[PDB]
Amino acid sequence: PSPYVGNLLNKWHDYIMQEKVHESIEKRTEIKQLLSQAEDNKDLVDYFILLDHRHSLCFDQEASMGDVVNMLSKGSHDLLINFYFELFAGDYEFFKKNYVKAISFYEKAEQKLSSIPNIEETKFAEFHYKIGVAYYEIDQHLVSVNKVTKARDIYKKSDMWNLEAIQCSLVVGINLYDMGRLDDADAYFRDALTEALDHGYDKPITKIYHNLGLVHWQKGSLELALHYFREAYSHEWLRDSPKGQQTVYMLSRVLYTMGQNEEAYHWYELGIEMARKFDDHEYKAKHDILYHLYEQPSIDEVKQSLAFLEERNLWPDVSKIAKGISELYEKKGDLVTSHEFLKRAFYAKEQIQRIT
Amino acid sequence: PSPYVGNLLNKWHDYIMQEKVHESIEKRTEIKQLLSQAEDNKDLVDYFILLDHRHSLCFDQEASMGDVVNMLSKGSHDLLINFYFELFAGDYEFFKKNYVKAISFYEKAEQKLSSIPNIEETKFAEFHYKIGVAYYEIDQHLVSVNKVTKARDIYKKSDMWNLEAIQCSLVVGINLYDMGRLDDADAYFRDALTEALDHGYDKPITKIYHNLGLVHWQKGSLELALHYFREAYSHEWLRDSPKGQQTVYMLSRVLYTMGQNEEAYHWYELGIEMARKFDDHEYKAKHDILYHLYEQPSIDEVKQSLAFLEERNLWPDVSKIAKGISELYEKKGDLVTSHEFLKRAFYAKEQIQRITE
Amino acid sequence: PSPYVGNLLNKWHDYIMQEKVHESIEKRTEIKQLLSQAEDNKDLVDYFILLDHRHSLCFDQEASMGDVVNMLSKGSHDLLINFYFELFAGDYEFFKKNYVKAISFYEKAEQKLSSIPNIEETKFAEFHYKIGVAYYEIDQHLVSVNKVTKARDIYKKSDMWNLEAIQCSLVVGINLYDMGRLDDADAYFRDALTEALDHGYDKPITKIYHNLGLVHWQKGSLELALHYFREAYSHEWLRDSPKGQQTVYMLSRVLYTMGQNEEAYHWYELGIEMARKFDDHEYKAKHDILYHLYEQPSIDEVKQSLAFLEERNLWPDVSKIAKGISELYEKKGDLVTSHEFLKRAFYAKEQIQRIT
Amino acid sequence: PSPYVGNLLNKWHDYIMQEKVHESIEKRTEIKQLLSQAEDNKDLVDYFILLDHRHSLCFDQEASMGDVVNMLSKGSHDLLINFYFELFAGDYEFFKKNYVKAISFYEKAEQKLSSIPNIEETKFAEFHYKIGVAYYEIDQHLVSVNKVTKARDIYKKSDMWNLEAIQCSLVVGINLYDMGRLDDADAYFRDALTEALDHGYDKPITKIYHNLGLVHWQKGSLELALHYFREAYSHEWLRDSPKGQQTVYMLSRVLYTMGQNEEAYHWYELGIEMARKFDDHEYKAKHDILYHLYEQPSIDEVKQSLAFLEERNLWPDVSKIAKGISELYEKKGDLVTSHEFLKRAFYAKEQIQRITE
């Protein structure tokens, strides 16, 4: 249910406000088509109606059907419309990677939740989660754990929202890992895994196994980390989704670190070939560094690809890759360029606090 | 036909509740037709929309192939619909003269008014006024003054809604007059008059002058009472309102109570003729009593017309009319039949406390 | 629990507001004494405390115990104090016979009932009744029935307030009688009577029987009316209460109307003797008219006593007594003075609408 | 000793809940004694009264022989007491450095703030500020800026509470500096300075100048950084505050980073001597690293003092100090030990994300 239609409905709201018949008929016709699918978002349809009705009051031929200066129901329509405008603007800003603006809009919409009459317990969890995830994108991990736990506690009660609870504990686990509290993250991931198995869910499982792989990778038990990355690739057909690119990369990277090189190059091959398929320039850079480090060394070529990743922000990945390089160039006895990369790995850490 | 459509919209709400497509499309079409008359009511149009949408969701389902399983907006639409249903049921009961039922419905709708957003101060004054006038209809004057003052105080603050404030002080004054507190009624009436003159208004003026005329009539200064009734007739072209009958009648009755029988008959003539134009049997009865008292006396004929007014539950005017007769027939030396009418004027007073709906 | 202490507490509130230590210590000492009884009014004690505490904040030696400019709790203390001030002012104005002012204060206090946190269902019935009874004093019978029915419906629910429900239906019945709907008033009175008998209550019974007597008196069945007035005198020792004066009067008046005269004079005697006992000048006037009508006629003497009652307002009683006289002076053939009294009975009716 | 009394009052509330006369009279006397210090806290006194009354009703019963069976005022007193209990529990947890628990309690008390009458806009800003600073304590800078801006916007409206607004912009700036957004921190700091100068205020000025000094220090323009640290020392008599230690340290460190070793040692001297006056082992460690770096080098001695700072969970300053060392030891040609410290400065960075309570 793409968050474009939300922005479309928001634009339409702006067009009714500027009293512009012709582009208002345009926006409502694009929108009217898109939501004709079988079952796509209660909140969209409601916002459509609430805009269509106020569209009429400004554009349809009232001259025989009264004078709607400002009726009693405007107060309550205003409240819903302002709320829907802010919920969907939040969703769209989150879509554009503009997380600070997204939180701003969500928090305004969260406020209006009290004045709406029959608000359900779950519309509060929705905002708890959306805010909590947006905070996770900007490395505010403690508040993220705080808000999505609040959502999880609601989703635990009712037994219809069991897929959401799994996603919530998945998000707490990721926060706990990004911090470094690895055994707590492990626990959350394992609790999501068994809850996902008891039910028929398959969607989250893949992410769960990949995170478990990351936990034990950072834990240093690479044998067990490798196991989980394999299981992530096994479960769900990811080879032609864009989102399964990361598992192929991790598989290659661990096998190169354990000195497995033979298999590691085969996952490199598959990952280069996927970087073709989706034209993902970043995963091409990341697999480039693997190749020009373990296959055909070239310190200058690694800097080239590293430079590209630094131009893309992506500073967690830069920090950890550059640290890896410096650690490696130390067992190879070269202090001079190991220091060069540690300086780059350190600068990357400082780039994570800024979050511009 | 304002609160008829309200009852129509209420019935339509009742048909959606019973999940009945066929009579819902019927009433929604008469109303859709009926609401095309240019006639200022925001709340009717609003209630139509709020019902049209709930009509669609139960019978049409939008023609877009949505889901519409109790959306976020259902909660608040429910609340508005429940409110409109009771406001218009109140208006309709007020229409059928069932004032106790009307207050009951208004007070229920007044409650739900608190739990609604962006409400103007005046939507509360409206219920203060409606309840206050319904109480006036059942001779509960002290509470009516209390409630319509509450409305007046809000309408005074805005200073944009002062045409309503004038009507409020008009209603307080009328209550005070029906009680007998004549100088207090005078004060309210004169204060509404100067407020109506300071701003650009002619609509209320005529009623204002007619009440001032009534006050000083009951005060006994008939010269000044006659003055005000003249001004009421002058200030609007009343020869074609149905409601301007009351000024013509008082003019005749005042001039007959004074010794100006010649002019008094001229207004009698006009008032009989107005009783023709409209199907007003009351003012024919009241003008009948005038004629069979001052022109060609006939105690039996007066009894007939008075009897008709008593059959109409018009117990205030009967009380006052019968008292007048008794007072007159005493300076005419006839105690016997003066006592007959004082007994009837007294019985009428007891009929004013006793009122049933 | 006299409504003087309420006015006392209100005066004290006024003295703290004018920052007047010395008369504040005076008022709180009179009050502190009076409420030392075993069990006298929750609301009084609460208002005392709430004033004593704000008394301290203006008068006690804070100089070492902080600077109470305006703390957080002032908002909520203000609300309770303003409420108690208006409840007890209402009670006191009702005490002074100033019913319009009393309703004004009650209705302001009724409004504040929503903002207080744990308000019980019965504090609303209390105001419904108090307002409803105040309206009854000023002949606004339809609204009185409306409000005290609202109170009665609350008192019906819980089974601890069964004495109040009896009083409520007693008040509806009186309204219905003052209007003239005699069979409905009869029904309410009979329903209060059986409810009072099922329980051990004796306080209302006497008033119930006297009202039932009035109903059937106005109904014209004087035999049965006389029965109830007797039963009113029988139940409860009223001969030395001021409030039992009215039953002795009714007993005498009915027996004089039925031509019983022998017994009627004996109740006249007792009623004159009670008018001595309490110096009730009105019941002396009312019994005077009985005597100078049925015992030693004197049209001039009746006018004298009637004049006194008209100087006391009491216009219901004047209207009905004067009407009685005129009716009687008609079977005696004297139209001249019967008309004199009907004029006076009619004027009295007009005095009931004014209520100045 | 402000939030100690809060915990004392909370314990007293706990003793009334367990219906325990003997320890209730004890704590209520220490608090009654302790609150005689002239020290601005409305809310403490208020909480005492609200507890003293509930103490009486459970143990004294007023000494007037009342009834006091849950009166009308009990409902609202309950609500205030529950609120004060959680506000002061929050303050006490903040006192013990347990910031996550403190936010938990503040957020609970923030909820009950909505259901209370006559509330000022600022009592909401207070919780915005307290929560915002607690989040700053656990390096959650983006939410801290978000919450303390919310406080600032209320404190700006009043225009009576602008000394608080200055403190709010001080806190936003510090967050922005801890992040690295130096020009945005600069802007907030300069805007607080002009607001502090336009009105009559000296209290914040010193901290304002010290942060501006820090910004441009991290910006690398040491000449102007040195200027601001001088002004911080000048603007208040800091020779007797414990908190003015930080300006003396920066002055020395800046002058040592520049080539002004002579003056730098004079501020080192003063800073060692201040580390004596107070039991501040941190600033002795930090000044120790300065001395064993620029005066009498000893890489092993620096490791000792740095180690002490790492044992204190002071991971920001260790990150910056270790980075400084590594940078310096490279122009000194020694890559080997420069790498040793960059590894430690990097480890310190990872220690800043990981924080446990």
Numbering used by the authors:
A (entry chain B), C (entry chain B): 9 to 364
B (entry chain A), D (entry chain A): 9 to 365
What does the paper say about this structure?
It lacks the conserved residues essential for phosphatase activity and has been shown to regulate the conjugation process. RappLS20 activates conjugation by acting as an antirepressor of RcopLS20 (22), which induces the formation of a DNA loop by binding to two closely located recognition sequences near the Pc, thereby inhibiting expression of the conjugation genes and plasmid transfer.
The apo structure shows that RappLS20 is all α-helical, consisting of 17 antiparallel helices that are connected by short loops. The C-terminal region consists of 14 helices forming 7 bi-helical TPR motifs, making up the typical solenoid structure associated with TPR folds. The inner surface of the solenoid is lined by the even-numbered helices from H4 to H16, which form the pocket to which the peptide binds. The loop between helices H3 and H4, indicated in red in Figure 1B, therefore marks the boundary between the NTD and the C-terminal TPR domain. The interaction involves the protein surface of helices H5–H7 and H16–H17, including the C-terminal residues. In the absence of Phr*pLS20, the NTDs are positioned such that they allow the interaction with RcopLS20.
